[PDB]
Design a protein around this ligand. Sequence first.
Ligand code: EPA
Lengths: 334, 282, 197, 227, 55
Amino acid sequence: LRQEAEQLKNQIRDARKACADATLSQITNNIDPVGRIQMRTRRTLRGHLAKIYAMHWGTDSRLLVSASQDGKLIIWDSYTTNKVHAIPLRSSWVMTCAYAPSGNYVACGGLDNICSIYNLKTREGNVRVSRELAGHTGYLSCCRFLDDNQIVTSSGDTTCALWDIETGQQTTTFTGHTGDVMSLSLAPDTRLFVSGACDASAKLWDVREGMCRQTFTGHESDINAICFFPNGNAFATGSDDATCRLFDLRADQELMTYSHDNIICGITSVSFSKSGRLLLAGYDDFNCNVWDALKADRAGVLAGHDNRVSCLGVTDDGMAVATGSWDSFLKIWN
Amino acid sequence: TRFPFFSDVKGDHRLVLAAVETTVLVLIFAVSLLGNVCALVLVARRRRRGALVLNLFCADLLFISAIPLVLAVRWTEAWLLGPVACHLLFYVMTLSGSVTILTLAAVSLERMVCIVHLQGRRARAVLLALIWGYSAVAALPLCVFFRVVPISICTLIWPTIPGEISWDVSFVTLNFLVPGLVIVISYSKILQITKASRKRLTVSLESHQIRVSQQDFRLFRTLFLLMVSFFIMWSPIIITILLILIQNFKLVIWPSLFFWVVAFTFANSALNPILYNMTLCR
Amino acid sequence: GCTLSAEDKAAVERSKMIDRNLREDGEKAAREVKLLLLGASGKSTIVKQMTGIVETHFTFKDLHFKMFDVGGQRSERKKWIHCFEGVTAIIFCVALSDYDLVNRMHESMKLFDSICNNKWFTDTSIILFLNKKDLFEEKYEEAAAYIQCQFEDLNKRKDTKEIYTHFTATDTKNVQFVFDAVTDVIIKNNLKDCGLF
Amino acid sequence: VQLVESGGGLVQPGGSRKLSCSASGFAFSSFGMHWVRQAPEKGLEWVAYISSGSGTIYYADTVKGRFTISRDDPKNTLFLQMTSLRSEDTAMYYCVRSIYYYGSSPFDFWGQGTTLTVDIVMTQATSSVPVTPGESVSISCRSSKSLLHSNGNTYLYWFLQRPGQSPQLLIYRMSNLASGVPDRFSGSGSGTAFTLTISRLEAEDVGVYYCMQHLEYPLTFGAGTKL
Amino acid sequence: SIAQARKLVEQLKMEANIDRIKVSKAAADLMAYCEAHAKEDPLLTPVPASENPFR
Ligand SMILES: CC/C=C\C/C=C\C/C=C\C/C=C\C/C=C\CCCC(=O)O
């Protein structure tokens, strides 16, 4: 009956408690603090006329794609603040965007339950739709390219699906969440990915096998953002209860919590740095926060914006940080 | 037979009489400077985040720029400073005032046009450049004939009697009556549109309708105050201009009258920040 | 700038053309009137005369209207309702023939309290529709005034928004009333933009 | 993607003649268009240029004033108006499409060509090289000044013109390889001296090779190396 | 419902079959990566302005 499930859930907690010998508070005591760090808006990206919910950095750390409610995808240069491309979307209700690792495609999705892939390099000189993905009952919230012809999508129907662009059909379907799935993050080796849901829980998936490896709890509110550590052995979680925390895949625990009494708003986007000792979180009180990510102490504030910060992103070389917001502006910090 | 602008032999209690003028001028200058700097910086932001008033808040600052020279001229008899200053001191005032009036009229016209065509940058830019371009072409007769007769009193001397009166009528009509008629017509049309729309909507419905009276009263009070504020403190300068014209043609003008009127017109630069950008709570 | 090459100048020209196209599209997108349709409840009857997000298009007196139906989104509204922050008006449909049954009236008032006092639709007006009138006639004016006032009082921010109420007026009134409410909302919006209030 | 040209023929000197190019198969409204002519003697000469939005127009300092370039984006047609033709205007005229953003290929496609019968210096010391297939060849050309801009871009382009065929882009910005070109070709250089290296030469590599600079207008071509 | 319960308990048993390691070792391995990559962080350590593409 259901007694075995309760006993197994109790014993997995007992096994979890048998490994927590030292939390991530006493291990890092002799380490020098980062200290106060200041970033200035090197570039401001104007051209959007509505709320921005998603931005993605290119692989070359120069190009950038952003989405907004005006039915527009804009590709920026970010060095000379030019606009490489402007892609009009059929559905103006978009909440996610992606950039292919090869630089040949971009993806978008939202309330229309449709993931669209656009070809950026055609002989005709214009960007056109290459494939449309259908099969999600709920609205899509995140999409990330695995390779040139493989994408993973997260929707609001408590499911995650692995697609094949060539045939336009679901290759693998990931099920097991009891709430709306909000965020996705791909591992550096592109063999695993983590998923955040509105059931206050996140779990690790396997792309090849197609089944969940482990699940992580601890939050008491819906998860909004997720991202791995650069080494791929850890990931950070953002939720609406003003708390960010870090989980370890090998330890299957929660390491440190990044919270403060002055903050009561929710976290919308998170992102690490190149070395991993700088976690950046976008909050709902109109300013980003910069965290030590190893001592749970704030070390910077990005207060340039005048509305809710919705998306964050660092470059692959770590040279800059791009943030979007609900005031239709993107700012490059360095 | 020369009218001594900004110059009188006060005598008597010179300390108190000049002290009152100095206090009034200093207070007006300081409050106008503060109001306009804090009403221009807080409109720079609005142009920074999304989208005819910056021109007003710069024109009245240019207006109060002249206050330091008037305060110096009020002391030490009549016009110790050189003829170079006299040529441009009245030009800057007659330019800033005309630009202010034209800016008020244009703001009213654009407010009316925005709600008869419900909900470019170059058009507004060239319109502003034009208002200045006309006011600078029209206020030249003040700078050109402003000679300094020998005590020496700096009085404008006009070559011909028809020339004296023609510029006066051409500068009162196209600078006070046409802008005033435009502002009155625009705000009357705004009120008509609002009242008609609300009657049309309230033909079909309830005890909170008395709360619509508060809402309508607000707009009407605001529009009435903003209409009559243009006439209360821009009419005295016009009536003093005609009074000068009348006394040049024909029977007396109070010696220090002109300075006090100048002061009441100078109050425009302090006030317009409040009546056109009153958004802030305090 | 003299420090640019020829290709950089051509790229800047392309970026300027893109900017011009974006402005010329946003200008045309600012003349759409954005309506969000909600209910529980006769919404089909309200749309009859004139998968994800549903839409509808219709023209009345040179105004182009967008309606959105959210009945097909079987998810919690706390995640995607902020996308509609900025609509001209919110249409709400309530059927009067549910006062004595098990009670849809309490659910309707709870939904109204949740949507009218929502932290995002603080400045968005609510167009309120009593759909059922013939069925409600069976088991009058005092009761209708009571229900109207009862639905009206839930407005917590009683100053920044107005709740226009109709009594659908079987034919053709439904559109005209929405046109009058949209015109009034646009007019009062401009006074806020210009500061005339 | 196909450009068809018309307007050529025989014209008496001192007259006028209009050339038209009909674009088809691509978004002509987002491409800038050049005109490049070729005399019966081996060589290339840039003539004119019109921007994507018709806001920028350039000419070479030899036909400026008497030549007019225009486009009609509704009709997808490019025009070149030529007046007072001299005896030195006998050339084979080509239409070249161009798009300019970060990472684009500005000289990828050339037209079929039309015939009419009536500054930085790029030099190519080599004129002809006898060679057999399967042997690697190196083609090098020098520049009057350094082509490396401060932003890191070396504006050098490479073109191959097979006999009885239109020129084709191979290397753009002196490093990158054009699409549809086998990886046998490779480009290299440093500031002033540049070289083009071809490995495993095949029977389709015969032709004339030109190196073109794009640092500043007017664009200048090389002499041409025959293989 | 019984099939769903059986699938859930099988999935949870598979999730409970993975071994764990000491949290101290995981923290040490996490901090070693940060200690060995601090030189190439343009945000943790400011870059010279000459090598800054965002001047
Ligand atoms: C319509 C704007 C009127 C005045 C500009 C605003 C403030 C400046 C006030 C007065 C201008 C200075 C001196 C008066 C100028 C001419 C008066 C004597 C000329 C005359 O009427 O014959």
